[PDB]
Symmetry: C2
Subunit: 358 residues, 2 copies
């Protein structure tokens, strides 16, 4: 089944989303998320002006080959723009393949490893008290895990002294069963993150993510050597080469690279495999700037992957969900993979047209 047509679709049902659609001569089509928040048009042009023309005429069943083919075109380079475009193509081809196989994507990957995928919600507030309120309502919704953030009265020093109080407060009010995560937004140096890790050890965090800027993977060594608080990193990584050392040296517990920014299903399957050799688990970055297409594919991946950790959940706007109909569902804090052939997500082009890029 050759590729007869392929094109990008830019819509803004709440926020900008770029989608790639590929249609085979047999009529079957597939879509993949190509949204790169804050630089959306760079990817759109990349696909339109360079990738799409090359897709025409190619055999859509050659997923691996197309991935390698496009990777070569980028001159073997890893980059946010480069890998998002490739991931979009990869997601579309896997969509087409699963449909062609008449099975939901997770079946194509190796089958179900779990019935549902645990998620975590964002609980932020200006004060520790506000935050505790959010945690309260989210645990009501059934979430078994929450990411907690709050404002710091008054600076690195103030943050380091305040952070522990927040976690102490959450534990006093909610107990030890709840999984609590925290993002440090890479504001720290390795030794400062080490200090933070040690200070929050009594609160047993699920993870402490994005502790320090990690372009230099060795940055995590000092943290790992000084604390037993679990570490997560990589929401912004684009290649397995951005985390190969982190994983092989066992400096992290969760890899956060998401499908769209990490080259797609093909590439992340390999990162997950490498991670499993070292006890590292998946912890897919799941912000709103990652369309329901990515989310659906992510849920399928999460359903199959043996070393599954947790899935981030930042609910999309109703308009976004309308434009991107899907069969994955959220229930009692967990996601359930769809059972429809393909990744179970589609795009309503007409409705999408009613929401122009902004």
């Amino acid at each position: 089944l050759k590729i007869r047509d392929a094109y990008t679709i830019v819509t803004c049902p709440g926020r900008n989303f770029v989608t790639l659609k590929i249609v085979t001569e047999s009529g079957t089509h597939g879509i993949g998320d190509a949204t790169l928040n804050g630089r959306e048009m760079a990817v759109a042009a990349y696909l339109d002006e360079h990738v799409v023309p090359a897709l025409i005429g190619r055999d859509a069943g050659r997923i691996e080959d197309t991935w390698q083919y496009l990777y070569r075109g980028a001159y073997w380079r890893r980059g946010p723009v480069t890998m998002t475009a490739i991931a979009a193509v990869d997601m579309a081809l896997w969509d087409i393949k699963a449909k062609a196989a008449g099975m939901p994507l997770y079946q194509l990957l190796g089958g179900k490893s779990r019935e549902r995928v645990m998620t975590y919600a964002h609980c932020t507030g200006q004060t520790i008290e506000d935050c505790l309120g959010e945690v309260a309502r989210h645990v009501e919704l059934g979430y078994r895990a929450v990411r907690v953030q709050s404002g710091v009265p008054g600076s690195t020093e103030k943050y380091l002294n305040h952070a522990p109080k927040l976690f102490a407060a959450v534990r006093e009010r909610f107990g030890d069963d709840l999984h609590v995560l925290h993002d440090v937004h890479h504001r720290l140096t390795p030794i400062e993150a080490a200090r933070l890790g040690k200070a929050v050890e009594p609160y047993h965090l699920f993870w402490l993510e994005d502790c320090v800027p990690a372009e230099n993977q060795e940055s995590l060594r000092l943290i790992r050597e000084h604390t037993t608080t679990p570490l997560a990193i990589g929401e912004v990584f684009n290649s397995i080469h951005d985390c190969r050392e982190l994983i092989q040296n066992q400096w992290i517990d969760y890899i956060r690279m998401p499908l769209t920014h990490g080259g797609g299903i093909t590439a992340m399957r390999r990162v997950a495999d490498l991670a499993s050799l070292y006890h590292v688990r998946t912890g897919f970055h799941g912000p709103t700037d990652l369309s329901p297409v990515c989310l659906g594919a992510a849920i399928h991946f999460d359903t199959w992957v043996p070393n599954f950790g947790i899935q981030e959940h930042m609910p999309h706007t109703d308009e976004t969900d309308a434009v991107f109909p899907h069969d994955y569902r959220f229930e009692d804090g967990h996601f359930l993979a769809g059972e429809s052939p393909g990744h179970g997500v589609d795009i309503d082009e007409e409705l999408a047209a009613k929401y122009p890029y902004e």
Copy 2:
């Protein structure tokens, strides 16, 4: 589609072969090679007496889960018997899945990466001259690569001195285009293999395999540090853990672990992924004691895998091919993957019955 029945089949159309067959309630079935040369009955009993009973009632689409499930039963242990049984189950389930998907196995894995898979033939003789004869006829058959072995007039010392003469002779008579491989059958110590590697450098071997006993992976260090002759190892490995260090330290160029002895498609997919991170390529062990079932699955794997190296070919007897009908074909020195749903191989139970275990 639940597993309604599963059983082993032992036949001897030339040599002993153990096959596992799994049948789903929907009628669809799949088979996997479980032949462990010289200890065939150990695996047969393993499957019959312990694995089969546990397969009944399980969902055959859960390949990953079944793999992990059986791995746990073995108490997380890697072993020739243990992994062959698991590989048989894994091959059968992948067979069922591809059929269910209505596509040949290579399509299910990610599509075609190459049109045909290069092979190499065994060219042995009592004398260098006999060997050259075999090479002559095999290159006539279209083979682009050959493994050369010959008797040693007269001992490690005699072998070390004779080996270079054999390669010099093959190069003088056939030129530099031909790929020539050599198996040292682990008769050497690391420093002796290093010496051999250096001595044959002028003959540019495709590879020198099984240089030394490698249970201790560090055994390859000395060889790699003293020669630029390509190294291949692992025809007898059962786990990714038997070669993780060899690969990450770049001490080898080709991994030889085959599907049946290496836990199947599921497991070897991961080993191939790890290998690609370090320029290591696949070089599947393909003796006759590995049934056409394994060969068919191997050809599909070889067709997709990006870091494909070469496929070993030791033709089966006509009786073996009769008992195991298949759609893969050999042409001009290369294999062509079948296009039939599943891995394209089946077993004629009636005919198989006419050849009892020996």
